[PDB]
C-alpha cells in the first residue's frame, strides 16, 4: 500500500518560509527517487524538485533554485522541502511524488494527472 | 602477392642449388 | 634460372655425343699411350705421355656462359698413365676454370616469421571460427562474412604449409637423384602443380574476402538498403568464386605455356600479372574503402581525445581490410630488387601471416559481443 | 463536502486493515517448513522457435498444449507447432505494436491487440483456408495490454485506459466494463472456472473482478510499483503478481492478503511474466534480468533459473498439461523449456 | 467529480468490507494441500521420461 | 499416416518461411520512428511537413514516408493516456524517438521544463538507453516574439539563462536578435546537458530547431536516421 502524506503547508506571507514534509509508507523509501510536484490554481501539475535514492543528486525547476531545499531522511522515510523567500506564484497544491520504479533514474509520469504514487497534496498559499 | 613471390624466389634458389649439386655429383663421379 | 631438368638433359646429350665420339675418333696409338676416358664430367681425347690435354668447360653447365673461354685440363704422366693425385685412385684434374663464376640467410628467416605467423593465426582463427559458429546469438550476416574471412585465412595458412612441404619434396635429395637418373620426380606430377594452384587460389580468396569485408562495411555505412540473403550469396560468390576467374585461367595458362617446376617460379611476369592484378584491384578498392570508412569515423567523432580513439579505430580496421598490404602492393616484383625486395617480402609476409591472428583477436576475442557471450555462458554455468 | 466521504473511505480502509490483520495468524512461511523443498529445477531448451523479426511481446499456449500463438512487434502472430517447431500460421497484423495475444481455448480464434486500442479477433478455421480478421473490438481508449478469451464468443481485454472490458465477439460490442484501477491495467488472468478474473495495474494493486457482474470483488495491495504480470494459482483460489519493484507476490482471494513474497537482494529487475506450473508448486517469473526464475511457490526460494534469453523475457506460458514452459523474450525468440 | 469519486470509493470499499475472509493459516494450508495433491502430474516438478516427453 | 501430416506441415512451414523472408526484407528496410511531444508542441506541424514531402480515435497513427526511396514509418502515439512508462518501452527498437518540444509555449506556463523532464525520463529509461532521440525545438516563430519583446522571461523559470551567452559554435540566421539565439541555444544546451550526462555512446541526441514553414525536417530526420544507423554499424565493428 503506497501511501504518501504531505504536511506542513498552510498560508504564509510573501517572503516567508515553510517546511513541507512527506511521510512515506508501504515501500522501501531509500530505493526510490522522490520528487515534489506543484499544481497551481487553474493550471496543470508541474515538477518542482528531484532527489535521488541517496540524496546525492538534487535538481530543481528554475523557479525555485536558491529558495527551495529538498532533502531526505531514509531513516525516518521522510521527504522535506524547505521553502524560503516564498512568492505569490508559489501558491499551489504541493504533492510529494515517488517515481514509479526502484533503482532507476527515469521518473516517468510523476506530473501526470492520475499518477498513482503521489500524495493527496497540501495547499501552500502565499 | 608476397607468397607467390616468395615461393618463386625460394624455388629459384632451390633449383639453382639442385643444378649446383648435380654438377658437384658429376665432379665426384656417378 | 636454369632448371635442374634442363641441365640434366644437356648433360645427357653431352654424354651421347661423348660416348659416340669416344668410340669414333681413332687413337694415335703412341708409345706409352695415354688412354681416352670419360669421368662423367668432361670428355678428354688422348695423346702422348707426359703432356696435358685441355678441353673446354662443358656446355651443359648452368654457368657455362659465365666461363666461356675457360678450360679444364687433365695431365698425363711419363708412364703413359693419367697423372694421379696423392693417395687417391682418381687422376689429377684442375677445374678451377669451370668451378663457378647467399639469399638463403634471408629466405629461411622469412620462412620462420612467415610460418610462425600462420601457425599462430590459423590456430586462433580456428578458435575464432569455433566461437563465431558456437554462440548462436552471434550469428548474423556480419558474423557469416567474418566466418568466411576466417575460412579464407585458415585456407591460405594451410596452402602455405602445404606449398612449403611441396617445395621441400620437389627439391629433396631423393627427387634430385630421380632427376639425375632421368627418372620421373614429384615435379612431373599433377598433384604438385595443384598444390601451387591451390596456394594461389587460397591467397586470392583471402584477398577477396578482405575485399568482401570492406564492401560489406561500406554498404552498411553507405546507407544502402539491399536484400540480406541476396547480398550474402553475392558476397560468397565474390569471395570464393571470383578468385576462380583468374586463378583457374592462370593455372591453365601455366599448363599451356609455363609448367616447368610446379608452377612455383614466376618466369613470365605477364602470366603472374593474371593473379597479381586482380589482387591489386582488391587491395586498392579495399584501401579506398578504408579511407572512406575512416573519413566516416572521424566525421562522427567530430560531430560527437578524438585522435586516440581514431588511432584505436584505425589500428582495428587495418587488419580487417588488409590495408597494410597497400604499402608495397604497387612496388611490383619486376621492380623490387635487393634490399627493397627483401623489405617488401618481409613486411607483406609478416603482416599477412600474423593478420589472421590480429583479425581473430580484434574481431572475435576482444570483441565486446563475444566477450558478453562468454560472460553470459560463464554466469549460466555458475548458475548450474 | 469531500472530507466526510474521504474519512468514511479511510474508515472503511481501516476496517479492511483490521479484518486483514485478524486473519494473519501463520501464513505460508511458517506452515510450509514441514514440506521438503523442490530442490534445483534444471529445465533445458527443448525447442527454440525462430521466425519473429522483432521483440516478442505476448505468447499464449493452446489448450492442446501443442500449438502456440506468439505476437511480435513485426505486426505478426505466428501459430507454432511447438512439438515440431513448424509454423502453422503467420498472421500479419494491421498494427505492428501488438502487446498481447490470445489463443481461443477452442482453438478456432486468435486475438491480438496493443497500441492500436483494438482487439483483433482472427478466425483460424475458415472455408478459404486463409486466416482473416473475424472481428475488431474497438472501444478501449488506451492500449490493449492483455486479452483473454472467455470462450469463442466472449473475450476479456485489459487496457491502458485503466479499465477492463468483456466483449461479445459476434456483435463486437463491449458487454461489460470493469473500472476501478487508477493506473494502466497491464495483465489479465482468468480463473479456471472463468467466473472471476484478476487484473494488475500500474497503481501497484491487483483487483479481482466478477465477469458476469462487472463488479470489483477484491483489491490487493502490497506491491510497491507497477504490476506487470498476473496469473492464477491452478485452483483459482490464489494468484501471483509480478511487479517492477523486483518482487513477486502471492495473494489468496479468501484471506485477502499477500501470502508469499518472492524476492532476492540480487534481483533488482522487475518481473515481466508470471506463470504457475500445473501443480502450483513452481512459480515461473520472467525478468528484466533476461532470465526466468523458477521459485518454490511455497518456500519462496529460487528453485531454478531458465537462463538463455539474450534480452528481456517478456512472456511466459506453461502448457495446460504442465509439460512445457514457453518463454518469449525481446531477443525475438521463443524457447520451450522442459 | 471531486465528490463523486469519493462516493464511488466509499461504495467499493463498503462492499469490499463484508467478505467471508478466512485466516491466513487456512489459506496457506489450501495451497499446500493443492501443491502436494497434484505434485506428481507436474512435469516441471517431477520431470517425465523422454518416452513420455513430447519435447524430449 | 504421420508422415503425410508431417509433409503437409513442412509445406505450410516453407510457404510461411518464404513469406517471412519477404517480410523480413520489408521490415529491415523500413525505419520505425516514434513521435513524442506535448499537445501544443506542434507535432501536427511535424506530421504535416512530413506528409507534404477528439479527432484521434485510433491509439496509434502510422504515417509512411519515402525519402531517397528509404521507407520511414512514423508512429504518432495519439489516443493514449499521459502515463507513458509502460507503452514507451514498446519503442525500444525504434530507429529514433522524434521528441518535439513546445519551446515557445513557455509563458501551461512551463511546458519547457515538462519537456526537459520527459527527455530525462527517455534517456535514462533502461529500455531506451539504446534509442536515439531526434530533438525538434519546434516553435521558434513564437520564441522570437516572446524573447525579444520581454514576454518570454526565460530567466524567470531558468535563472542560469541570465548568465548564458550565445555559444562559440552557434550559427544564427542572418538578422536574428542575439537574445533569441541565446534562448534557442540555451534551451538546446539544457537538453544537451540532460543528454550528455548519460549517453555513454549507446544513443545520441540530434537537436534541431524548426518552425511551421520548415519542411526540410523530413530530411533532417532522414539524415539523423542515417547517422544513427551508421553509428550502430560503427559500434558493431568497434570503430566508434
Ligand atoms: C587449435 C588448433 C587447430 C591449432 C592448430 C595446430 C597447429 C599448432 C599445427 C597444425 C598444423 C601444423 C603445421 C603443419 C605443417 C608444418 C610444416 C613443418 O615445417 C612443421 C611446422 C608446420 C608449420 C606445422 C606447425 C604447427 C601447426 C600449424
Ligand atoms: C578440401 C575441402 C575440405 C574443401 C572444402 C571447401 C568448402 C568447405 C567450401 C567451398 C564452398 C563453400 C560453401 C559455398 C556456399 C555455401 C552456402 C552458404 O549458404 C553457406 C556457406 C557455404 C556452405 C560455403 C561453406 C564452405 C564451402 C563448402
Ligand atoms: C569448388 C569450386 C570448383 C566451385 C565453386 C562453387 C562455390 C565456391 C561457389 C561458386 C559459385 C557459387 C554459387 C553461384 C550460384 C548460386 C545460386 C544461388 O541461388 C545460391 C548460391 C549459389 C549456389 C552459389 C554458392 C557458392 C558457389 C557454388
Ligand atoms: C601499417 C600499419 C600496421 C601501421 C601504420 C600506422 C599508421 C598508418 C596509422 C596508425 C595510427 C594513425 C594515426 C592515429 C591518429 C591520428 C590523429 C588524427 O587526428 C590524424 C591522423 C592520425 C595522425 C593517424 C595517422 C595514421 C596513423 C599513424
Ligand atoms: C597502411 C597505410 C597506407 C594506411 C593509410 C594511411 C592514410 C592513407 C589514412 C590513415 C589515417 C587517415 C586519416 C585519419 C584522419 C584524417 C583527418 C580527417 O580530418 C580527414 C580524414 C583523414 C585525413 C584520414 C585520411 C586517410 C588517412 C591519412
Ligand atoms: C605472439 C602474440 C602476437 C600472440 C597474441 C596473443 C595475445 C596478443 C592475445 C591472445 C589472447 C588475448 C586476450 C584474451 C582475453 C582477454 C581478456 C579481456 O578482458 C582483455 C583482452 C584479453 C587480455 C586479450 C588480449 C589479447 C590476447 C592476450
Ligand atoms: C591462440 C590464442 C589466441 C587462443 C587463446 C584463446 C583465447 C583468446 C579465448 C579462449 C577463451 C576466451 C575467453 C573466455 C571467457 C571470457 C570471459 C569474458 O568476460 C572476457 C572474454 C574472455 C576472457 C574470453 C576471451 C578470449 C578467450 C581467452
Ligand atoms: C592514444 N593516443 C595516441 C596518439 C598518437 Cl599521436 C599515437 Cl601515434 C598513438 C596514440 N595511441 C593512443 N592509445 C592506444 C591506441 C590505445 C595505444
CSV table of N, CA and C in Angstrom, one decimal, chain D residues 128-182:
chain,number,residue,atom,x,y,z
D,128,UNK,N,-12.0,-20.8,-46.7
D,128,UNK,CA,-11.0,-20.5,-47.7
D,128,UNK,C,-9.6,-21.0,-47.4
D,129,UNK,N,-9.4,-21.6,-46.2
D,129,UNK,CA,-8.0,-21.9,-45.7
D,129,UNK,C,-7.2,-20.7,-45.3
D,130,UNK,N,-7.7,-19.5,-45.4
D,130,UNK,CA,-7.0,-18.3,-45.1
D,130,UNK,C,-7.4,-17.8,-43.7
D,131,UNK,N,-6.4,-17.3,-42.9
D,131,UNK,CA,-6.7,-16.7,-41.6
D,131,UNK,C,-7.0,-15.2,-41.9
D,132,UNK,N,-8.2,-14.8,-41.6
D,132,UNK,CA,-8.6,-13.4,-41.8
D,132,UNK,C,-9.3,-12.9,-40.6
D,133,UNK,N,-9.3,-11.5,-40.5
D,133,UNK,CA,-9.8,-10.9,-39.3
D,133,UNK,C,-11.3,-11.2,-39.2
D,134,UNK,N,-11.7,-11.8,-38.1
D,134,UNK,CA,-13.1,-12.1,-37.9
D,134,UNK,C,-13.8,-10.9,-37.3
D,135,UNK,N,-13.2,-10.2,-36.3
D,135,UNK,CA,-13.8,-9.1,-35.7
D,135,UNK,C,-12.7,-8.1,-35.3
D,136,UNK,N,-13.1,-6.8,-35.1
D,136,UNK,CA,-12.2,-5.8,-34.5
D,136,UNK,C,-13.0,-5.2,-33.3
D,137,UNK,N,-12.5,-5.3,-32.1
D,137,UNK,CA,-13.2,-4.8,-30.9
D,137,UNK,C,-12.6,-3.5,-30.6
D,138,UNK,N,-13.3,-2.4,-30.8
D,138,UNK,CA,-12.9,-1.1,-30.6
D,138,UNK,C,-13.8,-0.5,-29.5
D,139,UNK,N,-13.3,0.4,-28.7
D,139,UNK,CA,-14.0,1.0,-27.6
D,139,UNK,C,-13.1,1.3,-26.4
D,140,UNK,N,-11.9,0.6,-26.4
D,140,UNK,CA,-10.9,1.0,-25.4
D,140,UNK,C,-10.2,2.3,-25.9
D,141,UNK,N,-10.0,3.2,-24.9
D,141,UNK,CA,-9.3,4.4,-25.1
D,141,UNK,C,-7.9,4.4,-24.7
D,142,UNK,N,-7.3,3.3,-24.6
D,142,UNK,CA,-5.9,3.1,-24.3
D,142,UNK,C,-5.4,1.8,-24.9
D,143,UNK,N,-4.1,1.6,-24.9
D,143,UNK,CA,-3.5,0.5,-25.5
D,143,UNK,C,-4.0,-0.8,-24.9
D,144,UNK,N,-4.1,-1.9,-25.7
D,144,UNK,CA,-4.5,-3.2,-25.2
D,144,UNK,C,-3.3,-3.9,-24.5
D,145,UNK,N,-3.5,-4.2,-23.3
D,145,UNK,CA,-2.4,-4.8,-22.5
D,145,UNK,C,-2.5,-6.3,-22.5
D,146,UNK,N,-3.7,-6.8,-22.4
D,146,UNK,CA,-4.0,-8.3,-22.2
D,146,UNK,C,-5.4,-8.5,-22.7
D,147,UNK,N,-5.5,-9.5,-23.6
D,147,UNK,CA,-6.8,-10.1,-24.0
D,147,UNK,C,-6.8,-11.5,-23.7
D,148,UNK,N,-7.9,-12.0,-23.1
D,148,UNK,CA,-8.1,-13.4,-22.8
D,148,UNK,C,-9.4,-13.9,-23.3
D,149,UNK,N,-9.5,-14.9,-24.0
D,149,UNK,CA,-10.7,-15.5,-24.5
D,149,UNK,C,-11.4,-16.1,-23.3
D,150,UNK,N,-12.7,-15.7,-23.1
D,150,UNK,CA,-13.5,-16.4,-22.1
D,150,UNK,C,-14.2,-17.6,-22.7
D,151,UNK,N,-14.5,-17.4,-24.0
D,151,UNK,CA,-14.9,-18.5,-24.9
D,151,UNK,C,-14.8,-18.0,-26.3
D,152,UNK,N,-15.4,-18.7,-27.3
D,152,UNK,CA,-15.4,-18.3,-28.7
D,152,UNK,C,-16.1,-17.0,-28.9
D,153,UNK,N,-17.1,-16.7,-28.0
D,153,UNK,CA,-17.9,-15.5,-28.2
D,153,UNK,C,-17.7,-14.4,-27.2
D,154,UNK,N,-16.9,-14.6,-26.2
D,154,UNK,CA,-16.6,-13.6,-25.1
D,154,UNK,C,-15.1,-13.5,-24.9
D,155,UNK,N,-14.6,-12.3,-24.9
D,155,UNK,CA,-13.2,-12.0,-24.6
D,155,UNK,C,-13.1,-11.0,-23.6
D,156,UNK,N,-12.2,-11.1,-22.6
D,156,UNK,CA,-11.9,-10.1,-21.7
D,156,UNK,C,-10.6,-9.4,-22.1
D,157,UNK,N,-10.6,-8.1,-22.2
D,157,UNK,CA,-9.4,-7.4,-22.5
D,157,UNK,C,-9.1,-6.4,-21.4
D,158,UNK,N,-7.8,-6.1,-21.2
D,158,UNK,CA,-7.4,-5.1,-20.3
D,158,UNK,C,-6.7,-4.0,-21.1
D,159,UNK,N,-6.8,-2.8,-20.7
D,159,UNK,CA,-6.3,-1.7,-21.5
D,159,UNK,C,-5.5,-0.7,-20.6
D,160,UNK,N,-4.7,0.1,-21.3
D,160,UNK,CA,-4.0,1.2,-20.7
D,160,UNK,C,-4.9,2.4,-20.4
D,161,UNK,N,-6.2,2.3,-20.7
D,161,UNK,CA,-7.1,3.4,-20.3
D,161,UNK,C,-7.7,3.1,-18.9
D,162,UNK,N,-7.0,2.2,-18.1
D,162,UNK,CA,-7.3,1.9,-16.7
D,162,UNK,C,-8.4,1.0,-16.6
D,163,UNK,N,-9.1,0.5,-17.6
D,163,UNK,CA,-10.3,-0.4,-17.5
D,163,UNK,C,-10.0,-1.7,-18.1
D,164,UNK,N,-10.9,-2.7,-17.7
D,164,UNK,CA,-11.0,-3.9,-18.5
D,164,UNK,C,-12.4,-4.0,-19.1
D,165,UNK,N,-12.6,-4.9,-20.0
D,165,UNK,CA,-13.8,-4.9,-20.8
D,165,UNK,C,-14.1,-6.4,-21.2
D,166,UNK,N,-15.3,-6.8,-21.1
D,166,UNK,CA,-15.8,-8.0,-21.6
D,166,UNK,C,-16.6,-7.7,-22.9
D,167,UNK,N,-16.1,-8.3,-24.0
D,167,UNK,CA,-16.7,-8.1,-25.3
D,167,UNK,C,-17.4,-9.4,-25.8
D,168,UNK,N,-18.6,-9.2,-26.4
D,168,UNK,CA,-19.2,-10.2,-27.2
D,168,UNK,C,-18.7,-10.1,-28.6
D,169,UNK,N,-18.0,-11.1,-29.0
D,169,UNK,CA,-17.2,-11.0,-30.3
D,169,UNK,C,-18.1,-11.0,-31.5
D,170,UNK,N,-19.2,-11.8,-31.4
D,170,UNK,CA,-20.1,-11.9,-32.6
D,170,UNK,C,-20.7,-10.5,-32.9
D,171,UNK,N,-21.0,-9.7,-31.9
D,171,UNK,CA,-21.6,-8.4,-32.0
D,171,UNK,C,-20.5,-7.3,-32.1
D,172,UNK,N,-19.3,-7.6,-31.6
D,172,UNK,CA,-18.3,-6.6,-31.5
D,172,UNK,C,-18.5,-5.6,-30.4
D,173,UNK,N,-19.6,-5.6,-29.7
D,173,UNK,CA,-19.9,-4.6,-28.7
D,173,UNK,C,-19.3,-5.0,-27.3
D,174,UNK,N,-18.7,-4.0,-26.6
D,174,UNK,CA,-18.3,-4.2,-25.3
D,174,UNK,C,-19.4,-4.4,-24.4
D,175,UNK,N,-19.5,-5.6,-23.8
D,175,UNK,CA,-20.7,-6.0,-23.0
D,175,UNK,C,-20.6,-5.6,-21.5
D,176,UNK,N,-19.4,-5.6,-20.9
D,176,UNK,CA,-19.2,-5.2,-19.6
D,176,UNK,C,-17.9,-4.4,-19.5
D,177,UNK,N,-17.9,-3.4,-18.6
D,177,UNK,CA,-16.7,-2.6,-18.3
D,177,UNK,C,-16.4,-2.7,-16.8
D,178,UNK,N,-15.1,-2.9,-16.6
D,178,UNK,CA,-14.5,-3.2,-15.2
D,178,UNK,C,-13.6,-2.0,-14.9
D,179,UNK,N,-14.2,-1.0,-14.2
D,179,UNK,CA,-13.5,0.2,-13.9
D,179,UNK,C,-13.2,0.2,-12.4
D,180,UNK,N,-12.0,0.8,-12.0
D,180,UNK,CA,-11.6,0.9,-10.6
D,180,UNK,C,-10.1,0.9,-10.5
D,181,UNK,N,-9.3,0.7,-11.5
D,181,UNK,CA,-7.9,0.9,-11.5
D,181,UNK,C,-7.6,2.4,-11.8
D,182,UNK,N,-6.5,2.9,-11.1
D,182,UNK,CA,-6.1,4.3,-11.4
D,182,UNK,C,-5.0,4.3,-12.5
